[PDB]
Symmetry: D2
Subunit: 416 residues, 4 copies
């Protein structure tokens, strides 16, 4: 009825003795507040069921959520960690491009997308590479960043703090405070910029196999606590002052790197360019120069000297539990093509991606389906013997798959 | 046919270099084939695949399919936008993102609501052609800028589809390269394939006037699609949108745990000065990409287009009788979006579109559903900016 | 003053007849305040025509700075020959540019085209709300709205002919980019006059509009900006030439294949790694700056006027000939007004056959000068790139 | 050749008895006169050089050093803006320009700064750069070279080869970027008081010679691969700095903003945010978050014998304005300029008229007891004068009319 239901709710034995309708009655009349539903209802799926039911009555079409699935999904690894106000899950089709012949190994790359032909095209690119003797890649740099903004009374004071951070002694003190927060914390050279009394400080460090935002933030907050002891008039405006730079386009990531900086390359014989890619080396180069270099230049691109790196980065990231919003900066790529061999008929190809933001532990990689795709690549979880090696390998795979994707689309655009 | 054989027998046929009548059994066999090639043969255990509607995916949205990836969906709302309320779905695995955005919606609702406008509408495709000499490409640019030249090109472009309605051309020369940016609305479709078809016919017509022209590529990165580029920021691409709200001083204190004065200081020195020092083009915001990407995954959009669709400048100012109220606006000139085609043909993705009342084509007013979804995106972005900026202020 | 002494006038102030004595007195007054009173010893000031400078080109004038002018030519451009003046203090610059001119000449000369023409100004206005700024953008975009604004703008001057508007919104800010030719003048003052009269007219339709500044940096004038690269500003120009393989080896001391390699990997890839917007060239700014100083241009406008993409590819039957092109979207320039009122810089404009207004075809002298700047830049690219390729 | 006449030498070249442009070796003031006379008859108007000055100017320091094929010189009017009250000092700033009202406006900016207790500046960083592109057979090999250059022992070997070419050559930390088999190497060092291009180029070439021993396969494609970056707009100069990075600031009392600048603190903050931050942002600027730094930079440079072409990057500036004081009524202003490329020795600073302008500011030539102090000081004057210019123009725009 209503009164009886509240007696049963407050009875230490609880909400599981009420029906869905009785609980909703109690919400509509203002006896139980919308937010408290999380702790009161026992099972996670039943919490989702009720939130959906409440939501449906507020929609102009109450049957809207019919085909949004929710049942029998492991919400235990999601509640309090990955999502709030959960009403179900969104299934994204997963496909496989491979084998990807990279650094003398073969990889079957999972790709989550709803764009027709993207996987097939990426697959034909892998085929060209494989018959061409495989690709090779190198991690050139490694370190996630966080770029807080502090304010001092005057610009002369901000300059003083900058000079202090650049002394051997001052940096060593900040480094100890940063490095004390974690096993993996290992602060690299600080990069700083002034704008008046503003001072942007870019902390960079490895972070084992995790993407590292949480870890770099704990090291950063304690590093600024130490800096405040030497400069007590300094104010910390924001733990992020956009100098990182995270999830926005920025030259600083392209130039300094962020996360993993990777280069990949292959040489495709003329015969493979002809039979797999249906074009010539000469035609490919002409398209690459005038589209990926000259065209991006006329559009005023910073870091966007590629055909569709973002397609590959986004499909792999969604499949592999990465933060897909980091496609903004992680897609940064320059794709170069030149003639190779004795008569300039073989295609040399390289992709350079200075800011791959990636990890195999933490965040979405804690969910089991996301982990199935990480296991396909042999990169799931933390590498105990060699910390960071799995995330490094996953970066290489992304760069190699991007190259495969650049090969195929460019050959398609070359013919017509 | 294949139904009279077992799994092991069909697999024997594939291994000897030599069809299946259900989509799901096709998926199963591909998974078994793939699993023998992996170092951990059990790695696919927790990748689900059963009972998914593969009939709308095969031959349309994905190839070599081995299952699906579940992304948790949460709701941020109610979002009070243009005298209406929306419950915004957000597919994400980042803890706190949905809660933070939800808090931004709460501040906006208590402050009277947000208001938005679509400022421009047209998807683009930017091919690169070339002529024997730069003088020749200059002749072609000139011809295209005459009203008679543009009219014959518009006639060719427009004949390919109902919604193909060529707007003003934008051209750029680099030596004998000519980059031509074609632009048009596309109903409620995002419109890539449609504009591509109009482009092919228009260039074919241009060749009749200029036979020495070579079409080097149907995209010469002048569009620009899925790469950062100032041209999308300055000219727009897809929907250009602005949203705004005024948040009373009291609400900023109670819901957001800061003050108007503090919000302004952080916005200016983070989203304007900070982004400036970082050398940003179009990234003058805190985390528009989090909300764009989450809404996109949930609503069947092309998540790769978060690259350009995330472009956003966030501005905060003093407001009201005593300058204690918080004016906020987000401006997003290049939201690339649609409610038909691509991932929006799938049923779960269509559930999230039905939530917002923007699913499929609007018959009475073509494009209105895609326009409305772009406004919701800009409003949900503004909500997400409100809260995170407030969190960073404290 | 005529009956007084240099010293008595100086004591009057502490406690004029001609311009040169006004300069002499200012120099002496200033020399008192310097730690080294004889600093101005070798700063020349005598026998300079100060009448055209006062109240027009410079204030508090203590003299003038001599910048060596050298000549690079002949430059065979559009079947004409040009002796290009270059005011510089950088050694080897004129000499290198000259070698590039010689290379082009032996390849049959350069061809250029003006692709677009219109100086801009980009005010920022504010409305009470973003919805009001959007209403104004929409109004400006209708044919009737644009026509009202065009009539206003065009009424201020005989050369004021308003082209298509370009606008951008940022909340309640609206940025409006006005564009028009301006005869042979660079045209900032003219464009500004037309802009303010047009904004006044816009205010009659939208009284709540606040005009924040007549430049809101949307122009964009004398700062690096992608809008100039993509939409253009002033004159947009392309120049090209084909250098025979024999000329590349003999005059330039390199090969076609080596030139293409250096250009791709320095001017495209290198500039791309450096995060350049509009700087896809070797040293356009050197040539631009030198011509500008010599021809009475606003040298500060070298910021955007130097915007350039230099391309090189194989040409001819053998694929051994060198094709070169420079594309310069935003050359800001004029042959009337400002520093081109002065007689010495007019001498340099007279060398080029472009001094003053073109009466038969207004704007044609400024266009011609922009073609010369782009051609001379291409010559400078040719030579510096050759020298980088051959490597000492 | 002095025993012949003008008309005779010209008759010899026209008749082709003597090679034309190989005559000024046999013949400086008269060498110019003959080049002009020969040149005038090739022109559509043979009297066009009439009013181009050439007599009574020292061409000896100019010939084979600053200019070639010289036909005269171009006078640029020089105004003075001052006193500029900067770091407890007072400067009279030479500004060579032909733009009306520029000197006057900058002057009003100086006047407001002086009446607000003056400005303060700091050099934040210092070092000229050169950014060659080298090529290895493969990206993997280019990666090898980048890892080697990053080891402390690889760096010291390169640092010793770099520092050997000059006493001022002190190589700072190397910055590298890979693009396939391309490696771009940004060499940076102080250069005393010189702007330092030729000096850094010397040390770079020797340094690459050393690197060529450890990796014989390396091709030096070009001594500049645009990674410096010199005389083109580039985010790398904005983010890393180049030449001198400098910051300047002052507080203008409210009353001074009203009486001298004819506006208010509130109006100035508003215009600055929406023009120099938001406006530049909408226009797609990297490094151009200012009103007209280029005007001031260009004018000082021309007057002081700097390379005016380097105004492209030297003008990079962000101008910030903010409420100051107890009632938020005073104006805080600051200009940050990360890439002022400048020098007081070498190039155009060797010419005497240019040296007079340098002497005016007390920075001509080398500072013997503190090397580089004169160029640093000039950099600070540039940034201070830029801030004066921003003050005045922004107030003019804020008021209107
Ligand atoms: C499937 C993808 C990878 N793809 C695209 C879309 C890429 C899109 O998401 C980003 C681009 O917009 C980025 C850019 O280039 O600016 C096109 C495509 C591209 C551009 C265009 F204008 C029209 C179509 C093509 C394609 C290009 C030429 C053909 F003649 C045909 C198709 C393919 C593609 O790779 N198809 C493909 C199928 C089976 C096997 C091999 C190959
Ligand atoms: C959940 C998200 C939206 N969030 C983040 C991550 C945003 C991330 O995806 C983009 C950023 O990297 C973009 C940028 O700013 O550069 C932070 C966060 C940000 C930066 C940082 F260094 C440390 C943490 C915060 C946060 C900020 C201040 C606090 F004091 C605490 C948390 C929140 C956040 O919104 N938390 C939140 C929870 C419940 C309710 C309300 C509010
Ligand atoms: C005279 C000028 C045009 N020049 C320069 C300086 C250009 C300078 O102001 C802009 C550059 O910095 C822009 C850039 O490329 O980044 C160099 C020069 C360039 C770079 C460098 F590291 C060392 C020297 C060269 C040069 C280059 C290679 C040689 F092996 C020798 C000289 C010349 C030049 O063109 N000299 C020259 C003389 C007679 C005839 C032909 C040719
Ligand atoms: C003398 C210069 C420094 N100045 C300019 C031109 C600057 C020009 O080279 C760069 C700009 O284009 C950069 C930019 O803002 O984008 C304007 C000017 C600017 C823009 C415009 F649209 C109309 C005029 C002004 C000015 C501005 C408002 C007034 F109401 C009047 C004039 C002055 C100026 O400083 N005048 C001035 C005179 C005596 C004393 C004090 C002050």
């Amino acid at each position: 009825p209503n009164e009886e239901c509240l007696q049963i709710l407050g009875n230490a034995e609880g909400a599981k003795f009420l029906s869905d309708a009785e609980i909703i009655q109690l919400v509509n009349a203002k006896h139980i507040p919308a937010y408290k539903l999380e702790t009161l209802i026992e099972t996670h799926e039943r919490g989702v069921s009720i939130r959906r039911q409440l939501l449906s009555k507020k929609l102009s079409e109450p049957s809207s959520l019919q085909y949004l699935p929710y049942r029998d999904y492991n919400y235990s690894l999601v509640m309090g960690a990955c999502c709030e106000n959960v009403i179900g899950y969104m299934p994204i089709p997963v496909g496989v491009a491979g084998p990807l012949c990279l650094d003398e190994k073969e990889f079957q790359v999972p790709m989550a997308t709803t764009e027709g032909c993207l996987v097939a095209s990426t697959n034909r690119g892998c085929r060209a590479i494989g018959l061409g003797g495989g690709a090779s890649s190198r991690v050139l740099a490694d370190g996630m960043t966080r770029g807080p903004v502090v304010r001092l009374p005057r610009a002369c004071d901000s300059a003083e703090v900058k000079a202090w951070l650049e002394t051997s002694e001052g940096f060593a003190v900040i480094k100890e405070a940063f490095d004390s927060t974690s096993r993996f914390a290992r602060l690299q050279k600080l990069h700083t910029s002034i704008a008046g009394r503003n001072l942007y400080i870019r902390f960079q460090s490895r972070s084992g196999d995790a993407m590292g935002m949480n870890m770099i933030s704990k090291g950063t907050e304690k590093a600024l606590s130490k800096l405040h002891e030497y400069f007590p008039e300094m104010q910390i405006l924001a733990v992020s002052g956009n100098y990182c730079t995270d999830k926005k386009p920025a030259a600083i990531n392209w130039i300094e790197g962020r996360g993993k900086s990777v280069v990949c390359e292959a040489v495709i014989p003329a015969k493979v360019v002809r039979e797999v890619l249906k074009t010539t080396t000469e035609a490919m180069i002409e398209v690459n120069i005038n589209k990926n270099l000259v065209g991006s230049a006329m559009a005023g691109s910073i870091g966007g000297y590629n055909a569709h790196a973002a397609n590959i980065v986004t499909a792999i990231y969604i499949a592999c539990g990465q933060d897909a919003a980091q496609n903004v900066g992680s897609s940064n790529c320059i794709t170069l093509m030149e003639a190779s061999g004795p008569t300039n008929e073989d295609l040399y190809i390289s992709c350079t991606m200075p800011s791959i933001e990636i990890g195999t532990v933490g965040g979405g990689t804690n969910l089991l389906p996301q982990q199935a795709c990480l296991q396909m690549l042999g990169v799931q979880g933390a590498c105990k013997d060699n910390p960071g090696e799995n995330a490094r390998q996953l970066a290489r795979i992304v760069c190699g798959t991007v190259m495969a994707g650049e090969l195929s689309l460019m050959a398609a655009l070359a013919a017509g």
